[model samples]
Structures are given as structure tokens and as C-alpha cells.
Target: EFDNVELKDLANVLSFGEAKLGDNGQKFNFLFHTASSNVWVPSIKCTSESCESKNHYDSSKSKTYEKDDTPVKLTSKAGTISGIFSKDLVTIGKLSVPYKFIEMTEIVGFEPFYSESDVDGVFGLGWKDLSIGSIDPYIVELKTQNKIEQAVYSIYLPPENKNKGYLTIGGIEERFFDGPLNYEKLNHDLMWQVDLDVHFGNVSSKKANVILDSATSVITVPTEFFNQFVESASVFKVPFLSLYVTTCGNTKLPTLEYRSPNKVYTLEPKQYLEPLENIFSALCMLNIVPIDLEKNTFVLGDPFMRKYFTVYDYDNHTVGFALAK
Candidate 1:
């Protein structure tokens, strides 16, 4: 049902089939796998009035399952989630892999609209540094096992979903997008990093690392820079969450640009202004969150990807983007 999804993750985090966790699925749009993890583990649902992912996992149902007592954690824009370690046979499309995952337990925040979603956990597409030193990343295993032709995965998210979204591994659909696939060198580290500066109105931020995350629903900018950004739009601010309400039809909104070495990628208002409902009814919850002062992670989430068709080049350590045709 890709037809009407917020489509938070168009990358690897997928629980395509029914889960072994009695009732679990639908990823929290804002999450971070900072530590070592296993094959992208999709967590369960956070529902009802409180909006929390009520935990559930039945090891008794799996052909091969292991219980580890090690505690674990995953971060989000809201806060951190704590869980335990476990391994179970999970299904992905036609393939079945005895995947390593987190048997999550106590999580205070992270799910803003849990009662309205069905995310089935996470599928890590980043490198292994985010995973335990030993658990091989899913795509790494797939390539080593000769399950794919190359260590490459492509993502194409169409605007207004004018065209269907596609997730291709090993190669790309030549017809999926037009224009040249522009390449950007990745900062040879654990997270997906690119060098760039951000611009909104007359203000601009100093250049730093630009991180790409599939699960983070909104774009996160530096605090001060983001403050300027929000003020540039509708001036109202909710003191509690510091969330600003803006017009969904902010046609006069500035053209958001990401300054890259070879290009200045831009996002129009339609790409940035998302409606706030099911949760916040106030100012059209500006999709951008300020990620603190000391943090250097300037980020990209669903908003930027919706315009530029992106590809992750695992073998060479680079990320490429092309205009979605």
C-alpha cells in the first residue's frame, strides 16, 4: 500500500510480511541507530492514547531464535529507546534470514503518532559501524552470499508520487530516473556523511557534514540556524515544543538550498511544508527540528530525497543523486 503512506522509509527498513511479534510493525519516523545493530531490526507499534510502542516478541514461535540479555538503545529526535539483544528468523520479501535484532522493551519517547501507524521495525541501510562489531549488515551479507550482482541500492521517490517509488538493490532501473546520476564523496566514517551548507532566506549556516537518514521523518538543522529558519516563515511558536505553525500554502516561502561541491540542490515549499494533523493541529508543524548546538550533523530525511533520486554505493563509499524523472 505505497499509495497513501507518509513513506517515512523508502530505503531498507521493511517488515514486508506479518511479524512473529504477535502484533508489531511500522517504524517511528524519527529514530537513530547510533550503536552496533544487527540486520535492520523493525520494532513494534506504539499505540492507544499515550502513543508508545507496546513491546511484544514471541521466541517460542521461531524455528531459530536466541535470547541475549545484553541491553541496547536507539536514538531519535525526541529521545532514546532501550531494548535487549536477540536473534530470530525474519522474512524479507522472498528471502528468509535468521536476522539479529533488538528485543526492545522500555521506550519513553520517539513515536509521536504511534497510535496511527503500523511500522514493523527498522532495516539498517547504513554501514556496520552502527551495528555490533560482529553482526554483518544485511546488504553486506547479501552481496557476500552472491544474492545480488553489486553492492549498490537505488531509491526513487516521486513528487506527489506522480510515479511509483522504487527500491532496487545490486543495480538500478535505467528508466526510473532522468538526468545524470551526480556523485558525492562520502566522509569515510560510520554514518552517511556529505559536505554541505544550508540556506534559507538571507541567512546561511557554516558548512559541515550533511547526514542522510531514512527513518528521521523531518529535516534537522542546527538550533540557531533553525531558529532563523522558523522565524523566516510564520512567526508563531509553541513554547513547549518550540514548534512553529506555518501556512500549508506558503507559496512565497523561500527556496531551500543545500550547497554541494558540484551543485546547489533546492527544495521548494511543496517539498518542505508538510501538514500537521493526527497529532499537532497548531502551526503546520514545521518539518524541521533543531538538533542542538554542539551537534554537527546537518541532516536530510524524506523531504530532500523526494526530489532527488538517491543511490548508496556501498563498495566505493559514496552517495549519488539524480533528478527523479
Candidate 2:
């Protein structure tokens, strides 16, 4: 039902794909994000240095571009990106559809992230409800245009194979996984939210509200539980980066588990403790972080998804997890 779009993996922490916008067919590398909604790209009107090297969208040059001056401010992990709403034709691989998206006029507090990668903007693969200013997500537009048969997508971020990740729209690809997927009902309709029970050795959190976000680089835990987990694991903080690091070859670390209703997903010590280089060469960086969120709420990001291939089913309101091959 679908063909795979090769994803460019950035240091195994982030991934992105290519798409064309407007009648001029201007190509851009966009981060295939599942955490948020609304597609955005730098505009020629943007004066920020972060947008300097990016391929900016020129509305005047595109015959299909429509004027929509509605201002929008999207608040995200990388700060708020403010822009005006615009309409244009977006082509993703074999599908083309009229999409309402953000034409960023200014980017705030995104320099650090933009400087490190080539991602021009986000191609949000989320529900319409999560979008700001009533903008339909890329997949929703594709479904509405009847360009795709199913409102579903799957992601495979290869941990061992560099630049081999893929985003399969409309269906799941079995070649990247080992067995049948263990599906679970979505706890919410907006993002890929699910209810899970988290277990780490002796510590456990029941009915944890979780979101599987492709944009997030690490598994974010509730601050209270994260504090306790850090202490129990004896990991020290890397002052400059605010990331935790433990002994490089530590074998006593607890195995982290996410228990769905019918299955349990496991992450061993080596999987969670990513090796560091240069000055911090002797230690391993913890692929986890603390987030100040409501109790028992977690964000399982790239690290978790890289281990368990994910399938987001929009029509059925379910998310499936499978073991990567």
C-alpha cells in the first residue's frame, strides 16, 4: 500500500526526509515529526540567521501559492516559531496535495539545533487536532486529497545502519521488523499518545500517559521519577550539556521496560547508554532526560522508537510496536 521514503539520520539522534513545495517544486529537507502538527518552512521574508542556509519558500515565484496572512505561533521544545499561514502544493514522493502550512517569518531559539543539522523545517505527521490555526497535517491533506488509501504511517530508525531509516506512509513495512506488531489503543486522538506501565528494576509507574515522538532525541521521564532513577543508577550529570553519563562498561544498570496491555517492550543497558566521544570518551551518555510534566506522563522519543519500530494507525486510533530486525 505504500513505498518507503529514505530518511537521512543525523548522528542517530534525528531523522528527516525530502519533499517539494509550491508550483516551482522547491525541494527542502524536513524533519518527519510525529510529536506536533502543521508543516512549516523558512520564508524569504525571514531575517533570522538560522534561516540563512535553508531553502526559503518564495510565494511570489509560485503560481499555485495562495495568500493566507493569518499569523501563527507554534510553541515547541525548540521554542516558538512564528509565521504566517499560507497554502501551496506539496509533493511527497508519489503523492501530491494542496497543503496549508506555515511560512516562517522569524525563528527564535532554534539556532543551536538548526546549526547542527540540515533540516529546513518540520513535516508534522500528527492529527489535525494537534495543529495550530486549523492547519491540516501533511498526512491529513494526503488523505483528504485521496492521494493515499490509508491514513497510516510507519517509522523505522536503524540504530546500527546509518542513513538507512525510512518513513512508510499508508502502511507498515514488514521487512524492517521481525514479527507481528503488538498494537495498543491510543489514549488520545491528537498525538501518538498511549497508556503504558513503566518498569525499571524495582521502580514502576502505572498507567503512564506516554507519547511516541520522532522529533525527541531522548526518552523523557517525569522529573520526579527521573530524579530517583538517576540516583539509583548512579549516573552523574554532564554540566555543560545537562546530560547524564555513567561508567562506560557498567553492567549493573537496570533494564527499562514499557508494559502495554498485552506486551512488554524492553531496553537493555547498552541500548540506553550510548557511548560518548572526545573529552567524555570514557563514559556513556544516558539516552534519557527529565521533563517537568504531569505525574506519570512520559515522552518516549527516538531512542525508544529506534529499538521498537512504530506503526501509527490514524483510522483505527491505535499505535503498534514491533521488534526491529
- Please give, for residues 1-325, the per-residue lDDT of candidate 2 as tens digits: 5867888767565568899898989999998889778888999999887888898899999999989889887677866678899999988887788888889998888658685668888888888787887566677667877888888888998866554788888877778799888899998787788899998876788999888888777877888787676566554532323347677767666888889879998888767777777445767778877787666788887888788899988879999899887
Residue pairs in candidate 2 whose N, alpha carbon or C atoms collide under 3 angstroms: none
CA lDDT of 171 in candidate 2? 76
Give candidate 1's error at residue 79 in angstroms.
7.4
Per-prediction TM-score: 0.69, 0.90
Q: Weakest 10 consecutive residues, lDDT, candidate 2?
A: 234-243
Shift of residue 230 alpha carbon in model 1, Å = 7.1
Candidate 1: which stretches are off by over 4 Å? 1-57, 64-83, 88-90, 105-116, 132-134, 162-164, 227-252, 275-286
Kindly list the per-residue Cα lDDT of model 1 for residues 174-252, writing each as its tens digit: 6657888888888755767787777877668756778876555567788878767656544543232335556565455
The 0-to-1 C-alpha lDDT of every candidate, in the order given, reads 0.59, 0.81
User: Positional deviation of 115 in candidate 1, in angstroms?
Assistant: 5.7
Global CA lDDT computed for model 1: 0.59
User: Could you tell me how far off, in angstroms, the CA of residue 233 lies in candidate 1 after the best superposition?
Assistant: 8.3
Best by TM-score: 2
